[PDB]
């Protein structure tokens, strides 16, 4: 169990020992941005719990040159001696410090080390990044990104989240740079040769993956929060203009979080910095939060309404992380969702409270629908789940940790009510401040939450409570909620609730929902097992808007309906993480209701119905003509979310058909959408006017009309593009329409070439983003390949965009094959650029394959994944893709003729 120069490595586990406990790091870093390298040193105050001969910690790609142990409690190690023997075992990304004399329990020691490396050239660790000025200059910065396990690439340390420590950081630098880190600068001292040295305030207790530091020449705008935090937004100097919105939102959002959590942001400053080469969307380093420019920067001339929404989300997400993630950290990556599922959810609570005009509450169900896609296939995972390798740990960052965690939190907030739920949050954050929680710690605090403070006297909590039947009720309801939620986190999957109505005899069955595996299928029963959930149902009826609630704890059950009404709608507003299927004439009652008075169902009830009908089709519980029949009402629907839910299914089929050459069906879908929905599409201005929803309805519908080659639409955009290009940018395309205008513009070699030129000159990354989409809508293979090839270079088109670009090319008919070929003929090369690992590789793989729907393609993809296995290239996304392609195949052979027929029938009457 041993490397490198022979000699046994004293330790076998990838998890570190618990024997030595870090307390404090002195960390000095001296980067040179001309020679693109750095020299560094550290001193780690450790406490030794049990006697040891060795210290195990993490270190990767670092050349350690000096190592010494000291102690003020253990005179054997009294200043200055002694040297440590250093042994490196790269396969666990560990090193061993060998001590001359067995360390003493309960004595503190100081581990000191010198190390050095080149600045990374790949998105992680302490790495090099570049940007372009308005003059055309090229500047360099050095930035850190450590989550999950890359801090060890920057300085040797105990790189696991449970090992929180104080960090005291110092940075030497040239006068043409500033240096930023987690904490405020205390002091800058002038050195002999003219260099400067920034000293930063010691951090509070925190995890290694959040340590951050940056050397750059960025500009900032500043403001103070109500509670007196200095919030600064940094960006390259020519872009300072674009940071205004971020300053405004982060102040407003930080204030809300302090009220909501009842806990102050503990640090005296908060920095948000727009990094030009940034792999993740954003990273929540405590006090120094890093973003993509597209995540932070906003520009009224070229950023759209949906750009604004996104920037607001991401800031909301990162600020939420200062509590969920930083203040309270998960014990180990198996509960990463404690961080991410929660930040994800706080987006909704915080944006809703601070910017209701953004309508984020109407968008949220999409968070849940996107997971359900993954969660209704066997290859899904439980929310909380073991993880060990860096690749495994990366894999935990997915729709299940984020969207599903958020969705089940939402479900529980609905159950407990806002007041009890926020109270649960507050005591959790307070109780675990500056250390760690695991899945159960969280469910205890949430299930034991006290309304109306504590409570009071002789209320249930706390002091001296009165023994009441009410008290007994409280205690058991609490334990109920605990049992319920743990099964939502340890069971993979989502349940289907099947509902049969017998006058007033509503009978309930629960079932694992399974996509493309029919009610009676060979393997269907084997996947049913002991999948059982405690499901907090809700429902209203046609004769009563009263919300009735009741917890289904077992496989089957019955409830009684006074008045024996027409329809019953389960899961009100879709706040529950489950699909509902109605037997008998239930679906016809609801569809009848929708065509006659849709308003009698709640707006979100409509969104969830539309969603469920089409899922169930795929589940073979309904036939495709039932779902298509529902979309008939959408002609009267003015609630944008349901309108867009419905449309998106019709649009999705069109691309599905169009991807194959099923042109007679795709043409009928084209004619059905432009004609049915002509009123709405024609109602839309080519402007930025109206409310946020108006603005987003517009870009949505006009994109759709332009995608179906609707002539007047294509004409208008073509005109706008022409005026723009002829005026050399001196005219303004309204932002909501920008991407559509550019892509129509890109259909000619002249327009295309012009756009690519604008790309290299533009100072709005949001604009660049839309341009790069446009170029990707090109019908010419020569162009799409050039895009791809440019992105390989990372010069003109930066490599943080390569994954998104292949994804964009692959989903259009002209691009899918080219993209699939490219990925297979350059896999080895893609891997030199990204971790296996990375969100990028996961996007590249799914982005180029998941849309496939033929047995042919299934074959090729099965063969490609089998091949990536050996080498030891394993990802969960392989199975997920195969089951997805399989889902699509079964869907086509099950429902395609029904689709063909339904459209032909619609042509006739009427």
């Amino acid at each position: 169990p041993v490397a490198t120069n022979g000699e046994r490595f004293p330790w076998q586990e990838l998890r570190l020992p618990s024997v030595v406990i870090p307390l404090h790091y002195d960390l000095f870093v001296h980067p040179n941005l001309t020679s693109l390298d750095f020299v560094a040193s550290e001193k780690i105050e450790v406490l030794v719990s049990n006697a040891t001969q060795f210290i195990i910690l993490h270190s990767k790609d670092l050349e350690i040159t000096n190592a010494t142990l000291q102690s003020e409690e253990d005179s054997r190690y009294m200043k200055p001696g002694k040297e440590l023997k250093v042994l490196s075992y790269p396969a666990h990304e560990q090193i061993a410090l060998l001590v001359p004399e067995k360390l003493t329990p309960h004595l503190k020691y100081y581990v000191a080390m010198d190390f050095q490396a080149k600045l990374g050239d790949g998105f992680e660790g302490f790495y090099k990044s570049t940007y372009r000025t308005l003059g055309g200059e090229t500047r360099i910065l050095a930035v850190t990104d450590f989550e999950p396990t890359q801090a060890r690439m920057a300085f040797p340390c105990f790189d696991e989240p449970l090992f929180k420590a104080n960090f005291s950081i110092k940075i030497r630098r040239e006068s043409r740079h500033i240096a930023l880190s987690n904490m405020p600068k205390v002091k800058t001292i002038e050195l002999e040769g003219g260099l400067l040295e920034d000293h930063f305030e010691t951090t509070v207790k925190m995890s290694t993956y959040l340590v951050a530091y940056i050397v750059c020449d960025f500009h900032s705008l500043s403001g103070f929060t109500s509670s007196g935090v200095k919030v600064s937004i940094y960006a390259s100097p020519d872009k300072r203009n674009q940071t205004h919105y971020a300053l405004q939102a982060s102040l407003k959002l930080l204030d809300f979080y302090e009220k909501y959590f009842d806990i102050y942001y503990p640090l005296s400053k908060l920095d948000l910095i727009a990094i030009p080469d940034f792999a993740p969307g954003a990273m929540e380093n405590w006090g120094l939060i890093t973003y993509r420019e597209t995540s932070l920067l906003f520009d009224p001339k070229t950023s759209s309404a949906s750009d604004k929404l996104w920037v607001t989300r991401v800031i909301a997400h990162e600020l939420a992380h200062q509590w969920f993630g930083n203040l309270v950290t998960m014990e180990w990556w198996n509960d990463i969702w404690l961080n991410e599922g929660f930040a994800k959810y706080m987006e909704l609570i915080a944006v809703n409270a601070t910017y209701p005009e953004l309508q984020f509450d109407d968008y949220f169900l999409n968070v849940c629908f996107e997971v359900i896609t993954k969660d209704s296939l066997n290859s899904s995972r439980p929310i909380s789940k073991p993880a060990e390798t860096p690749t495994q740990i990366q894999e935990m960052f997915d729709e299940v940790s984020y969207n599903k965690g958020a969705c089940i939190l939402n479900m529980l907030k609905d159950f407990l009510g806002e007041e009890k739920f926020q109270k649960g949050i507050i005591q959790y954050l307070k109780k675990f401040s500056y250390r760690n929680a695991k899945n159960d710690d969280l469910w205890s605090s949430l299930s034991n939450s006290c309304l109306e403070s504590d409570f009071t006297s002789g209320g249930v909590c706390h002091s001296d409570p009165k023994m009441t039947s009410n008290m007994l009720a409280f205690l058991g309801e609490n334990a109920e909620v605990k049992e319920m939620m743990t099964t939502w986190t340890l069971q993979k999957g989502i349940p289907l609730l099947v509902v049969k109505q017998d006058g007033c005899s509503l009978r309930l069955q629960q079932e694992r929902f399974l996509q493309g595996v029919f009610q009676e299928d060979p393997e269907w029963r084997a996947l049913q097992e002991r999948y059982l959930w405690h499901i907090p149902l809700t429902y209203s009826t046609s004769s009563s808007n009263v919300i009735h609630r009741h917890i289904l704890k077992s496989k089957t059950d019955t409830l009684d309906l006074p008045e024996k009404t027409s329809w019953v709608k389960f899961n009100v507003d879709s706040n529950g993480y489950y699909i509902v299927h109605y037997e008998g004439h239930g679906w016809d009652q609801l569809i009848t209701q929708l065509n006659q008075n849709h308003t009698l169902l709640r707006p979100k009830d409509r969104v969830g119905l539309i969603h469920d009908v089409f899922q169930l089709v795929g589940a073979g519980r309904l036939t495709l003509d039932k779902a298509l029949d529902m979309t008939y009402y959408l002609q009267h629907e003015t609630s944008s979310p349901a309108l867009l839910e419905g449309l998106s299914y019709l649009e999705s089929f069109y691309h599905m058909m169009d991807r194959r050459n099923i042109s007679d069906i795709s043409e009928n879908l084209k004619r059905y959408l432009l004609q049915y929905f002509k009123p709405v599409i024609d109602r839309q201005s080519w402007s930025d006017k109206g409310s946020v929803w108006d603005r987003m309805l517009r870009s949505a519908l006009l994109k759709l009309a332009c995608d179906l080659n609707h002539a007047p639409c294509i004409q208008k955009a073509a005109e706008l593009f022409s005026q723009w290009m002829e005026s050399s940018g001196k005219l303004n395309i309204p932002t909501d329409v920008l991407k559509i205008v550019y892509s129509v513009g890109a259909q000619t070699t002249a327009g295309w070439n012009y756009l690519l030129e604008q790309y290299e000159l533009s100072m709005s990354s949001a604009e660049q983003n839309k341009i790069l989409y446009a170029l990707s809508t090109s019908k010419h293979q020569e162009k799409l390949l050039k895009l791809i090839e440019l992105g390989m270079e990372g010069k003109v088109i930066k490599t943080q965009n390569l994954a998104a670009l292949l994804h964009a090319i692959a989903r259009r008919p002209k691009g899918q094959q080219l993209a699939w070929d490219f990925v297979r003929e350059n896999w080895t090369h893609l891997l030199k650029k990204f971790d296996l690992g990375s969100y990028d590789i996961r996007m590249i793989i799914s982005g180029t394959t998941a849309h496939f729907s033929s047995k042919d393609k299934l074959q090729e993809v099965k063969l490609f994944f089998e091949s990536l296995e050996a080498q030891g290239s394993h990802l969960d996304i392989f199975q997920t893709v195969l089951e997805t392609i399989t889902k699509n195949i079964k869907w086509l052979e099950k429902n395609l003729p029904t689709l063909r027929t339904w459209l032909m029938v619609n042509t006739r009457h009427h």
Partner: peptide, 9 residues
Amino acid sequence: XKHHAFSFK
């Protein structure tokens, strides 16, 4: 977050 996706449209 890496949910930069928002990848494109």
